[PDB]
């Protein structure tokens, strides 16, 4: 039973918009970043570190969040899957509920899954600064 979801049409009817769609997710993050006045370019690998993630939490509330203040620095994969399972932890609390894909599917630099979750955010921040 191939469960049909979002990637279905996105990949089966818009392999091009899927690319531009990631770039729109780069914009929402460019917002949490534009605060410290910066610029992101790889939403996919931005979770391959969960670093830019804890930064969102701070640049949103407006505070000093050093890149090495949250969990240690991701060195290998497991360490990255962690930094994302963690963002997923303060998120499951701060809301977000249960993400669809898995902390790996995100760090996996893959777009498909990572996009289903990024959508979830664009949804909650689209109206909230």
């Amino acid at each position: 039973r191939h469960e049909r979801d979002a990637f279905d049409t996105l990949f089966d009817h818009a392999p091009d918009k899927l690319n531009v769609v990631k770039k729109t997710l780069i914009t929402f993050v460019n917002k949490h970043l534009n605060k410290l006045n910066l610029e992101v370019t790889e939403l996919e690998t931005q979770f391959a570190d969960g670093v830019y993630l804890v930064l969102l939490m701070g640049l949103l509330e407006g505070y000093f969040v050093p890149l090495h203040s949250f969990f240690l620095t991701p060195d290998s994969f497991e360490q990255k899957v962690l930094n994302v399972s963690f963002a997923f932890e303060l998120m499951q609390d701060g809301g977000l509920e249960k993400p669809k894909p898995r902390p790996e599917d995100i760090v996996n630099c893959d777009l498909k899954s990572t996009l289903r979750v990024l959508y979830n955010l664009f949804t909650k921040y689209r109206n909230v600064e």
């Binding site: 979002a6 049409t9 996105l10 009817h13 818009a14 918009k17 531009v20 769609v21 729109t24 959508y119």
Partner: peptide
């Protein structure tokens, strides 16, 4: 949610 993704990205 294709039609929607673009109906909002307009």
């Amino acid at each position: 949610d294709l039609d929607a993704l673009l109906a909002d990205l307009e």
